[PDB]
């Protein structure tokens, strides 16, 4: 929508120089969508074109003359070698199970080694790489020591293209605080763990920055022998440089006249491009893309219904036939029938211990007459019934 949105990119020069009067505007590729899923899928494929053929000799296997010395000779049935006298006899020819014999399907030259990616999909893989070469969260997650740099995307003046001796390049990469990255590329010069070490790849290190110049006055020769850094020209812009491995966001350095051309290559949000015929910058599926302000939000939290705030687990089934406390929770009336028959069974044992007052007549001291003495005070309920129940 915008093309502006952070619309002032300061330019720096050789003495780390914040101050110009030249402040150019952010060239609107940098809002276009970062998509590492398409960048990885263009990278997977496009670097299959620097790739030449391996293939085994198509006569390996088959210049014996072995016929299957065939059943019934107590020995199995492979083609065995004919001769006698050379001790390669009979000895097993032609099969992949055999020593000497031809491999399962031998590798040919007309395997598809190279590939064609669609050319908009290259441009919508370069665009996501350029757009992620700003955004220093995604440079810093390639390693890339960038916490000395003073801007993103870092733009140096055009004068650095005239530099000519490499001593005056590590003077330059010192002053812009990016020497500490190419000092990290010195740290990881190692040896490979292959088979590389026999086959002429005895290592890389990691990558470093990428000086995107516009006109090599002497720049490319001046930055050759620094290990880690590599430069590029704005017209070319290889993707396999700007996202090494499928992984967006190499630490990049624009010069001034490099940076001022990106509003032509991939044109702008307003108009198409002039240097790429008919190209039109890709539109994201989600323009605002900040969820924590989308969910914040007061345009949405006047709709939301149910923030169910308990958990409600609390589960265990008790037993309402041994745990009495569940009976009175579940069938509350059944509490009554407990206090009715157990009260009525109380007076039964009261009556049957008074059957011993038929027999031995002992007490009745503080134990069982006191169980029945309350009836005499309970007589007053019937004695009030003759005087207080005659009020209505």
């Amino acid at each position: 929508s915008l093309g502006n949105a952070r619309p002032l990119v300061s330019v720096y020069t050789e003495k780390n120089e914040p101050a110009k009067d030249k402040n150019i505007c952010l060239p609107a590729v940098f809002k276009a969508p970062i998509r590492p899923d398409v960048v990885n899928e263009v990278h997977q494929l496009l670097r299959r074109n620097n790739r030449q053929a391996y293939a085994v000799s198509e006569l390996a296997g088959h210049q014996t003359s072995a016929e299957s010395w065939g059943t019934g000779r107590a020995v199995a049935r492979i083609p065995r070698v004919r001769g006698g006298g050379t001790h390669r006899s009979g000895q097993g020819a032609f099969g992949n199970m055999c020593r000497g014999g031809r491999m399962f399907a031998p590798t040919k030259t007309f395997r598809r080694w190279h590939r064609k990616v669609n050319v908009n999909q290259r441009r919508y893989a370069l665009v996501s790489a350029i757009a992620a070469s700003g955004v220093p969260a995604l440079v810093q997650s390639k390693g890339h020591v960038i916490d000395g740099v003073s801007e993103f995307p870092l733009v140096v003046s055009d004068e650095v293209q005239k530099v000519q001796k490499t001593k005056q390049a590590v003077i330059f990469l010192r002053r812009l605080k990016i020497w500490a990255d190419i000092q990290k590329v010195y740290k990881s010069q190692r040896f490979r763990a292959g088979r590389g070490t026999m086959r002429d790849r005895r290592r890389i290190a990691r990558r470093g920055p990428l000086v995107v110049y516009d006109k090599d006055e002497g720049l490319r020769k001046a930055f050759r022998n620094i290990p880690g850094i590599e430069t590029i020209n704005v017209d070319k812009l290889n993707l396999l440089k700007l996202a090494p491995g499928g992984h967006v966001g190499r630490f990049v350095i624009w010069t001034e006249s490099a940076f001022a051309r990106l509003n032509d290559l991939f044109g702008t949000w307003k108009k198409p491009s002039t240097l790429k015929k008919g190209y039109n910058l890709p539109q994201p599926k989600m323009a605002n893309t900040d969820l924590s302000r989308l969910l914040k939000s007061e345009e949405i939290r006047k709709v939301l219904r149910d923030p169910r705030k308990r958990v409600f687990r609390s589960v265990r089934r008790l037993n309402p036939l041994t745990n009495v406390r569940q009976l009175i929770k579940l069938n509350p009336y059944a509490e009554v029938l407990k206090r009715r028959a157990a009260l009525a069974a109380e007076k039964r044992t009261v009556a049957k211990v008074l059957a011993k007052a038929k027999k031995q007549n002992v007490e009745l001291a503080k134990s069982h007459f006191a169980n029945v003495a309350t009836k005499a005070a309970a007589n007053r309920a019937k004695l009030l019934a003759a005087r207080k129940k005659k009020v209505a």
């Binding site: 089934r317 008790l318 309402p320 069938n331 009336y333």
Partner: protein, 223 residues
């Protein structure tokens, strides 16, 4: 302005929980006095019809209790289907069944894998109190209180208490179909003391088919 709202919720959820407990007391009191006037009437009718020398038949039984008794293999595709529809798919599962001509001819079909009989009130109670579970969107929720019957069945039937389940099942009510399909089938366990043959009829050996009063005495040792 939230704390004003919740403590009016919290004190109207209290008054409704209080107005269930008394309304589930005097409703269990009314339901209990039915089961005293009922069985005392059938004493009164016999001690009547003896002196008038008539024969008092009692009522034929509605409400069976049907329990799969035997085995999940070697079963034929028409006893395989009746016993699916009776929800009896394991050994020693039991469901409540309303008896008419239309399920009795289905208990006839599934007869050698089923023992059944007509249950006591004590048997109806002890099966939903000790073993009794409940369907909350296919989940088998236990009982744990009588909110969990008040939830799904008070708004569209008038069952809210646990004794309203027992009343809708002992007296086979209009909401019977709702309150047997509410209860997940009773996963009883194996009777202590045992079975007798499991695969000769109750009149010959003792299991499958109508026990018809002795589902109560079996369920004593099964629940």
């Amino acid at each position: 302005s939230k704390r004003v709202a919740e403590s009016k919720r919290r004190l109207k959820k209290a008054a409704v929980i209080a107005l269930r407990k008394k309304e589930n007391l005097v409703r269990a009191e009314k339901y209990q006095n039915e089961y005293i006037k009922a069985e005392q009437r059938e004493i009164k009718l016999r001690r009547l019809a003896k002196k008038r020398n008539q024969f008092y038949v009692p009522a034929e039984a509605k409400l069976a209790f049907v329990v799969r008794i035997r085995g999940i293999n070697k079963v034929a595709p028409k006893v395989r289907k009746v016993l699916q529809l009776f929800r009896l798919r394991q050994i020693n599962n039991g469901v409540f069944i309303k008896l008419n001509k239309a399920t009795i001819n289905m208990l006839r079909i599934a007869e050698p894998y089923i023992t059944w009989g007509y249950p006591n009130l004590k048997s109806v109670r002890e099966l939903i109190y000790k073993r009794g579970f409940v369907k909350h969107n296919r989940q088998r929720v236990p009982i744990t209180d009588n909110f969990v019957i008040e939830r799904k069945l008070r708004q569209a039937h008038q069952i809210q208490c646990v004794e309203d389940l027992v009343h809708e099942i002992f007296t086979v009510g209009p909401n019977f179909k709702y309150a047997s399909n509410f209860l997940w089938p009773f996963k009883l366990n194996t009777p202590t003391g045992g079975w007798r043959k499991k695969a000769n009829h109750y009149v010959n050996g003792g299991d499958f088919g109508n026990r018809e009063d002795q589902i109560n005495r079996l369920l004593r040792k099964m629940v």
